[PDB]
Amino acid sequence: GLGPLQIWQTDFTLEPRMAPRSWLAVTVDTASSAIVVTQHGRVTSVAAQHHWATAIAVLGRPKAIKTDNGSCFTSKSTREWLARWGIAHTTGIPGNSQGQAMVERANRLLKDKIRVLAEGDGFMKRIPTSKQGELLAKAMYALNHF
């Protein structure tokens, strides 16, 4: 049982094609490379908690999650939510540089796939609100192919 560590990297990335809920919260399980994404109207502490509750239902509970120092991830509210779950959190090392690189790469592959799938459906600018969820789901499936 000397298998990979159950550690996640999480980040928010802006995607105007998904407006009005244009902030995409993306989590990469570093142990399997699975990706989970959710959309939100604003980046708050509560959006990050909503995102991780879903990721937890999808990937199970991690031992730890690594984020940057964005304030939605470092407020007291977030620290308490993570403590209630027993999940450890680290924002890395002060002036990390790298070490968030996997989720930054997932952010980019994700936006590219949304753009090619959207354009494939004839949406060259914003994706109609009513079509967003299924297209976000399709991009997520295309990047995991469970």
- Residue 74: count of CB within 10 angstroms of its CB: 15
The answer to the question of residue 132 lying near a second copy (CB under 8 A) is no
| Site stretch for a second copy (CB under 8 A), options 18-26, 50-58, 91-99, 100-108 | 50-58
List, as one string, the DSSP characters of 85-122. HT-EEE--STT--SSSHHHHHHHHHHHHHHHHHHHHTT
The answer to the question of residue 70 lying near Zn ion (CB under 5 A) is yes
Residue 3: phi and psi, rounded to 5, are -80, 160
| Site stretch for Zn ion (CB under 5 A), options 2-10, 54-62, 72-80, 84-92 | 54-62
Rounded to whole angstroms, the Cα distance separating 132 from 37 reads: 12
Compute the least distance from the CB of residue 38 to a second copy, in Å.
10
The answer to the question of residue 126 lying near Zn ion (CB under 5 A) is no
Rounded to whole angstroms, the Cα distance separating 146 from 142 reads: 9
Compute the least distance from the CB of residue 10 to a second copy, in Å.
15
**Which residue has 């007291």 as its token pair?**
76
Q: Residues touching a second copy: how many (CB under 8 A)?
A: 19
* CB 78 within 8 Å of CB 45: yes
Residue 18: phi and psi, rounded to 5, are -100, 15
Q: Nearest residue by C-beta to Zn ion?
A: 50
Compute the least distance from the CB of residue 137 to Zn ion, in Å.
11
- Interacting residues with a second copy (CB under 8 A): 49-50, 53-54, 56-61, 133-134, 137-138, 140-141, 144-146
- Interacting residues with Zn ion (CB under 5 A): 11, 50, 61, 68, 70, 145
